């Protein structure tokens, strides 16, 4: 388990590469996509991106953590 | 009890891992989830996340402290 | 009585642990709780939280001082 | 009378502890209390608070100077 | 007359203590007092306040220069 | 004529003390005076004020350069 | 695969020059193009631009990463 | 032609003193002049002003570059 | 081709002096020109301007890169 | 009284062992204790320390003279 | 008691091996630990280290005196 | 009058023991006392201290000459 | 146990070759690694390096003592 | 006239005791007096002080040459 | 193994010519390369340089030890 | 012409007493005069001062060479 | 190959006169050229300069080693 | 060609008196001239100055080598 001094969002996202996650993300000023729900499998997350790979259709998204609001897992968040 | 110089929000959240908490959180600009009420059991809280594990359905949320507004406990806040 | 150089909000809140206080707090952008009135007994206040313990129902709130607007006491503010 | 280099708002508020003052204060984003008029007797003012003690009902307010707009005295501002 | 390097607003306000001035001031976000016109006699002005003493009723205001918009004199601005 | 390194707004305003100027100024958030047109004779301009002396009625304004938008002269801008 | 300390958005965009990408981008304040969907082939991406070359019509866009919201790939994000 | 390290807006405006220019300028928050079109002859431009001298009526404007949006020339921009 | 450390927007704009470009630009707060489409030939681009020379009518615009949103080329972006 | 050649800070601090002193001390770069006010009774002061013994709670501090700013006595500085 | 010529910080720290001390230490430029409070029992202190042995968990720290700010004892500083 | 070779600050401060002086002093990095104005009667000044004895309240300060900026006398500086 | 005259940091680090240590180190000016936590087994420490050999993955670090802040042991610091 | 080897600032300041001088001085880190303009008559200047005696009000300043920036005379600098 | 008196950084770097090393280096004040990760094979290291020869592309870097922060080896640091 | 061993700044400034010079000087930390342009006639320059005598108004400046940045002559620098 | 006692940066730069080098250099405080990439052929390097002769355009730079950060060769560093 | 022991910057600048040079110089803390580009003909360079004589307008600059960053020649650096 990570200590206090490095338990940031990106480190935990990198500890759970392969967990079915649904990311609730909200882009500040839009008219067509004001709030988005990216469901899929986290393939890899850097400190400015969360590469989500939806297996239903195969579209590997590339989100930006700046607009992230909250990630809902389903099995076990390994911290 | 923590001294004055380190009694921040995250330290107290880390002192009460295992207390039934309902977090009232508000995302700044959304159309679908402007205000959310995350009820559950705090499993672990870093300095940029609060891993809430709802036991009713099993969805382990991963919130962001930036959008936090206030946490309502029910038993005893250990500070 | 505190000198000028350390008479901040949190220090006074820490000098009155146990006074019936009603905190008028306002969250910036919400649709459901735009303004809240947290009534109760101040149990302990750090520099980023005000643990209010309502004795009517037992829900020990944990507010954030950032959103604080003003605290109405009823007996004696000890400064 | 204070010199130029220390004639700030809080210093003058501390020079007039005991003057009937009506503070016109405005909280930025509220729906229920957008503008408030706190009338009473200034008991003590630090650099982040103005402890106003209304003698009509006895509720000793604790305002925040950040939201202050202007203070109307009635007898003599001692500067 | 002040040189260029110290001809700020507060210095001139301090050079004209005793001139009938009408201060047009505007508080950013209010519903009841969005724009105010404080008419009176400038008694003393520091670097964060302008103590205006209306002689019609005797209410010695204490404004904040941050919200100042413009001061209309009537006789002679001594700079 | 001023060099490049000191040709700011206030320096030029100080080079034309005595020119009939109409200052188009706009206060950010007001309900009664959102845009103002101060016509008159520039008596003296510091780095935070433009003392305009209207000769029609004699009211010597004292504007703030922060809210300035643009100054329309009529004879000759001496730079 | 990039380490943690250089896994930014632009580096990954530069690792996938030649992948069919649809960039969902949103310009903050517009009336005609508030949200745009730039579909095409990423030719080259610096740290302030993403040169997308649509092959349907031949218009080689030049976007700005500041307004980027999220990039949807279709085959394989190489990180 | 100016090098890269000093090819700013004001330098070019100073290289074309005497070219018929129409400056499209927009003041942020106004009710009466939200967008203005200053047509005329550029007499001299410092780093915080663009002295435009309309020859049709003789009103020598003095704009502020902060509110500038774009300048439409008609003959030749000398850079 | 430019390296990573100097591949900014202005450098590329300077590498393609002479390419038919249509710049989609948006001024933040306007009522008459909220979004503009400047079509023409890029003559020269500094780090705060993009001198576009429309050959249809001859009006050599002088835009500001701050308000730039995205540039659509038509032939070949040389990076 | 000490001569000129040995009247340093530490010598005088050693001549007044037993005087109620409030030391205003400031640590250069801190986020939690940027300025501290150590009130108490000076028990002994070497050339790199000032052992202050607060009698209110009994915590015998051990400050460092390097960070000292100024000592306020209350009765008589014996030099 | 030590004479004047050798009463430095390290000598006194070596005279009190075994006193419950809380060292308030501040590292100059950090983002995660800008100010630290090392509580424990001083086991041994050289001239460049203060081996603090916390008995609560058993982690024997090894601090550096360069970053020391001030040590708060609780029983008796033997000098 | 002192010769050139010994006319330092401390010597003159020692020649005027008993003159009402207001010392304008500035501590380098503070949040609460960045600039202080110590008014009083100079009782004695060594080469690292200026014992100022305010007679209004009786608090005999002990400043440090390192942080001194300038001393304003009122009657006669004897040099 | 080392005497006073040679009890420096490097000597003690050399007396404990083989103790599980977590070194909290902070590099002065970085954007990606401002604070690092090197956990492992100290293999050998000279006077300008601390060869830490993490056994989890096998990466034998080579730190620099200049940037060291503090070393947390876990079993016994032999001095 | 002084030779090259002793024509320092203090020597010239001592050659012009009695010349109306305005000293432009700047204290490094202040919030209230960042730049000061001491106007008056130079009474005597040592090698660490410039005793300026303003005759308008009678306050005989005592500046420090370390913070000096430049002295503007008005009649004749005798060197 | 080197003795204590010559176990510096450069000597050890010279004892491991031919070990795959990743040097984490940070240049103090840059906008484009604030932190760099030079991965490769150490060919030779003097006392002011570390000639790293990346075999992936063949670019033989020449770093400066002054900016070095820490070197991560992978096989065996021979000291 | 001076040899190599004595061709310093002050010697050349002393060889051109009487040349119209504009000294571009910059004081390190100021809010009102961060950069100054002293235009005039060099009357005499020692090794710590440059007595510039502006003939337009008669104010004989006395600059300090420490803050000098560069001197622009107009006729002939005699070296 | 140079021995240990003279293997400095300048000696090696002088051993490779004629190797295509790209010098990554960073000037401490600039607004226009904060980081520069000088690509070319090293013609000659003294102990305070590196005469780089770019053959693309013919501009023979003359850098300063003080601001050097790191030199990337491409063929063979001869040490 | 100069030997190693005297190949400094000033010696080479003195070997090329008469070469068209553009000196890129940067003054540390300025608001108006943070970076300057002095183009011209080097007339003579001592060890603390570089007398550049621009022939376009005739202003013979006198720079200071301390602020020098790098000199770009155009024909041949004779070393």
Q: What backbone torsions phi and psi does residue O33 show, to the nearest 5 degrees? A: -125, 85
Q: Checking phi first, is residue L40 left (phi over 0); if not, alpha (psi -120 to 50) or beta?
A: left
Q: What is the distance of C-alpha E5 from the center of its chain?
A: 21
Tell me how close the Cα of R36 comes to any Cα of chain H, in angstroms. 9
**Residue D29: closest CA among E67, C30, E35, E25:** C30
Q: Which of E8, E28, E76 sits opposite F48 (nearest CB)?
A: E8
Can you give the three-state secondary structure of P14-69, one letter per residue? Answer: HHCCCCEEEEEECCCCCCCCCCEEEEEEEEEECCCCEEEECCCCCCEEEECHHHEE
Report how far residue K10's alpha carbon sits from residue K48's, in angstroms, rounded to the nearest whole number. Answer: 8
Chain R residues closer than 8 Å to H3 by CB: 37
Best probe of the R interface among F2, F3, F5, F6, by most R CBs < 10 A, is F5
Per-residue CA distances from A65 to A52, G76, L78, P7 (Å):
12, 20, 68, 59
- Whether E56 contacts E14, CB under 8 Å: no
Does the beta carbon of R51 lie under 8 angstroms from any beta carbon of chain P?
yes
- Whether N60 contacts N53, CB under 8 Å: yes
- Running DSSP on this structure, what letter comes out for residue C60? B
Q: Which of D4, D9, D69 sits opposite E27 (nearest CB)?
A: D69
P72·R59 Cβ contact <8 A: yes
Best probe of the B interface among A9, A23, A78, by most B CBs < 10 A, is A9
K33·A6 Cβ contact <8 A: no
- Resolution of the determined structure in angstroms stands at 3.3
> What are the tokens at O43?
């060919």
Q: For chain K, what is the radius of gyration of the CA atoms?
A: 13
Report how far residue H52's alpha carbon sits from residue H68's, in angstroms, rounded to the nearest whole number. Answer: 13
Report how far residue M78's alpha carbon sits from residue F61's, in angstroms, rounded to the nearest whole number. Answer: 78
Question: What SS3 state is found at N28?
Answer: coil
Report how far residue E40's alpha carbon sits from residue L43's, in angstroms, rounded to the nearest whole number. Answer: 46
Sign of CA dihedral J75, J78, K1, K5: positive
Chain A residues closer than 8 Å to K33 by CB: 5
Does the beta carbon of H17 lie under 8 angstroms from any beta carbon of chain F?
no
- Whether M35 contacts K32, CB under 8 Å: yes
Report how far residue Q62's alpha carbon sits from residue R42's, in angstroms, rounded to the nearest whole number. Answer: 14
Q: Checking phi first, is residue L45 left (phi over 0); if not, alpha (psi -120 to 50) or beta?
A: beta
R69·Q33 Cβ contact <8 A: yes
Report how far residue Q40's alpha carbon sits from residue Q17's, in angstroms, rounded to the nearest whole number. Answer: 11
Cβ neighbours of residue D20 closer than 8 Å, sequence gap 6 or more: D39, D40, D41, D73, D74, D75
DSSP-derived secondary structure for K6-56? G--HHHHHHHTTT-EEEEEE--SS-SS-SSEEEEEEEEEE-SS-EEEE-TT
Chain E residue closest to P34 (CA)? E5
- Whether G47 contacts I13, CB under 8 Å: no
- Whether R30 contacts P27, CB under 8 Å: no
Give the residue extent of every domain in chain M.
4-72
Chain P residue closest to F3 (CA)? P37
Tell me how close the Cα of J44 comes to any Cα of chain C, in angstroms. 25
Per-residue CA distances from A22 to A19, A44, A46, K67 (Å):
10, 14, 17, 45
Note whether E touches D: 3 CB pairs or more under 8 A: yes
Can you give the three-state secondary structure of chain A, one letter per residue? Answer: CCCHHHCCHHHHHHHCCCCEEEEEECCCCCCCCCCEEEEEEEEEECCCCEEEECCCCCCEEEECHHHEEEEECCCCCCC
Helix or strand run (H / E) with residue J13: helix J9-15
DSSP-derived secondary structure for Q32-69? S-SSEEEEEEEEEE-SS-EEEE-TTT--BEEB-GGGEE
Q: For chain C, what is the radius of gyration of the CA atoms?
A: 13
- Whether O24 contacts O35, CB under 8 Å: yes
Does the beta carbon of R32 lie under 8 angstroms from any beta carbon of chain F?
yes
Report how far residue K41's alpha carbon sits from residue L77's, in angstroms, rounded to the nearest whole number. Answer: 55
Q: Checking phi first, is residue B15 left (phi over 0); if not, alpha (psi -120 to 50) or beta?
A: alpha
> What are the tokens at K78?
């033997």
H59·F68 Cβ contact <8 A: no
Per-residue CA distances from C14 to B5, B77, C19, J33, J58 (Å):
13, 16, 11, 17, 20
Chain N residues closer than 8 Å to P32 by CB: 34-35
* Bridge partner residues of N22 (DSSP): N39, N72
Does the beta carbon of J37 lie under 8 angstroms from any beta carbon of chain C?
yes
Tell me how close the Cα of L76 comes to any Cα of chain J, in angstroms. 23
- Running DSSP on this structure, what letter comes out for residue K66? G
- How would you label R19-31 residue by residue, b for 16+ Cβ within 10 Å and e otherwise? bebbbbbbbeebe
Chain N residues closer than 8 Å to E6 by CB: 37
Report how far residue A77's alpha carbon sits from residue B51's, in angstroms, rounded to the nearest whole number. Answer: 8
Can you give the three-state secondary structure of chain B, one letter per residue? Answer: CCCHHHCCHHHHHHHCCCCEEEEEECCCCCCCCCCEEEEEEEEEECCCCEEEECCCCCCEEEECHHHEEEEECCCCCCC
D29·E30 Cβ contact <8 A: no
**Residue K71: closest CA among K28, K34, K38, K47:** K38
> What are the tokens at O39?
């991965």
CB atoms within 10 A of CB K40: 20
Q9·O58 Cβ contact <8 A: no
Report how far residue O50's alpha carbon sits from residue O69's, in angstroms, rounded to the nearest whole number. Answer: 13
Chain J residues closer than 8 Å to C5 by CB: 24, 35, 37
Report how far residue M8's alpha carbon sits from residue O4's, in angstroms, rounded to the nearest whole number. Answer: 13
Report how far residue F42's alpha carbon sits from residue R11's, in angstroms, rounded to the nearest whole number. Answer: 56
**Residue J37: closest CA among J29, J45, J28, J25:** J25
Angle subtended at Cα B23 by Cα B21 and Cα B70, rounded to the nearest 5 degrees: 115
Architecture in CATH for domain H4-72: Roll (2.30)
| Tokens 């009522």 belong to residue | I31
Can you give the three-state secondary structure of chain R, one letter per residue? Answer: CCCHHHCCHHHHHHHCCCCEEEEEECCCCCCCCCCEEEEEEEEEECCCCEEEECCCCCCEEEECHHHEEEEECCCCCCC
DSSP-derived secondary structure for O3-61? -GGG--HHHHHHHTTT-EEEEEE--SS-SS-SSEEEEEEEEEE-SS-EEEE-TTT--BE
Report how far residue C78's alpha carbon sits from residue K64's, in angstroms, rounded to the nearest whole number. Answer: 40
């Amino acid at each position: 388990m990570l200590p206090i001094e490095e338990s940031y969002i990106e480190n935990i996202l990198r500890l759970n590469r392969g967990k079915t996650a649904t990311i609730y993300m909200t882009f500040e000023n839009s008219k067509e996509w004001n709030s988005k729900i990216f469901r899929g499998v986290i393939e890899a997350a850097g400190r400015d991106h969360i590469i989500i790979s939806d297996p239903k259709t195969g579209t590997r998204y590339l989100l930006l953590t700046i607009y992230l609001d909250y990630i809902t897992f389903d099995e076990e968040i390994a911290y």
